């Protein structure tokens, strides 16, 4: 009951959101297991995601990336039940966010 | 079950999760915000009285380290997360689960 | 059940997993010694299932030694593509049904 | 389970893990504080399993931490700062 | 079941594993390996004719790697194939 996750994000198209199948809920979880900054992103220059999810008062950034320093970060977090948008609030990218998108419990 | 996400700041740096049964907090990544004062050691201390313990879990610092994934977890128990040392921003994620 | 261990260079820059319940789990990319120093060598990820199609992996000698995506591909052909870099570069995990 | 955070310094350079119970060790982190440069090794010691041997190696300025997530059911098991003044920190769980 | 923690270097180059599986953990660069130099563990692995680097160390860069891989009823040969070490190969058998 799962399928991989993978969207990228860039200066032009700054956000994505998970959303599968919007109000029911059977269990469904994202994990993030990495994000990963692209190899044409300008050096030093600091490329920051954000996570957003309404259902728990959440903003905050959970990827601080810059090449020459932090090519990417593993945080294995997990969301559930709940709509999460990403965001490319800092930094032109381009960043990638791979996960498992697991569809119940 | 539900995402865990906190900032901590010079400002603002201390915050604690007090929920029951069967409940855990698990902390899977500590990372330091990109404005950050470069070079400067920003530790993060957690406290937990009913396993008598009190120690730092990340130790971040622009130019070196970024980010730690400790991915511990403090199960049925009151916890509270210092920033010790450090102006920070930095951010806690990990989730509750029961 | 299964090992997965497979290699990608200039050379042979793809590999194609074809294993149902079959699944393949890569937990580790990692970038060989005689890579280039400074040359960046990304792996572009792809299969069927959902037209996948992304890096998987960003790695250069004297800044990025290897990733681990921890991800996994479920009743699905994969192919692993070296598009930058002339490699070697190494990518670990395992195939369980 | 529970918590397990323990601290190794030259002043206090080793800790013994007693009592299906299980150390899981998730995280050695190296003190602020640490010298620059100093490399800093915990050696875990576990009998049961017939294994002396470093488990961390750590310095300011190039390691910061480890994550070994390794696990011992064994019984007692213990560690030592065996190079290094510390601090160093370890970080894992005792689960029932 | 088993901690499993071996080490390798120049003068032991070689280390052998022979329901059983072996997972490897973590494969740690020891602080008296020489700075700037390739450190690479291969594994060899019959029953699915696999051979090749799981890990590529080299101080002052990559202290550590954390393969995450398992080996699941085989025999398994550790090698150090370019480097003095020491290394150390951390893990568990179940
Ligand atoms: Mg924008
Ligand atoms: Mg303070």
Do not use: C, M
């Not at 998970?18 to 600091?46: C, H, M, P, S, T």
């Not at 995601?49 to 259902?55: A, D, G, L, S």
């Amino acid at each position: 009951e799962e399928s991989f996750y993978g969207v990228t994000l860039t200066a032009e198209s700054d956000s994505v959101t998970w959303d599968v199948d919007e109000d029911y809920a059977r269990g469904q979880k994202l994990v993030i297991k990495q994000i990963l900054l692209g190899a044409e992103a300008k050096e030093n220059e600091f490329n920051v995601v954000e996570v957003n999810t309404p259902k728990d008062s959440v903003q905050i950034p959970i990827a601080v990336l810059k090449a020459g320093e932090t090519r990417a970060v593993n945080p294995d977090v997990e969301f559930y039940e709940s709509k999460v948008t990403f965001k490319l609030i800092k930094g032109s990218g381009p960043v990638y966010i791979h996960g498992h998108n697991i569809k119940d419990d």
